[PDB]
Amino acid sequence: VEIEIRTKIHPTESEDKVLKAIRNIFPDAEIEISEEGEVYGRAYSLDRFRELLRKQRILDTARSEILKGRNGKEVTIYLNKQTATVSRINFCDENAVSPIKVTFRLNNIPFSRFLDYIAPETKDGRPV
Template sequence: MIHRIDVRVIAPVRDTEVTDRVADAVHNLFPNAELVTEPGRLVADAHSMEQFSERLYEQEILDSARKAFFRRADDDGFAFALKKQAAFEGVINFAVGNPDELGDIEVQVTVHDPDVEAFIDHVAPPTEEGRPVDPDDG
């Protein structure tokens, strides 16, 4: 199935931070993102979440990801925030509640094809007892 998506990643860059390090944090989770430096932040655009999805499987946090995605989903896409400190380590950690002092990485996903729910199912499939559910196993 072909997925047509636009991923926009916005990462605040504090005065105390090295811009390249923040760029590394974004690239750790979105390796194909094209970064642009703007005053006080980095903005990155990508068209794939494959590596992000692989990381969700590796970290076994598909359920957490689904919750985070659906919490801010609408007909056009979904958004979520990530802890910047974890991203430096290449780890996905969803930010819920107040951003920490470095600010959270904001991710906005616009889904053109298929629909939003089908794309979320692709990136972070439903699970049973922590394991991805394959509809073909039924």
């Protein structure tokens, strides 16, 4: 699993606060920012993301939003960049005010395997 992150730093945003909102969900991300504010990120550990989804009891929405964003061997979801500043995950649309576009690239593992690892059925009996 490779984690690709995309979003923007608008003229009125702080670079520090956007990099931290991103890191609050994906701590090991390396970010590059273009002259025009484009944010290109790459992460790997799903630990924190999984930890938060469970602590906030939102696996129901997570499991669903993952299915919806599944296209091929890639899964694209959108997280509210603002709520992420306080390490809180909110799934939103692509037109939000902008969001953190996260694109999971599945190398070997099958999709089904990915769904139950991130957002398994009930808060129960989960793969690791």
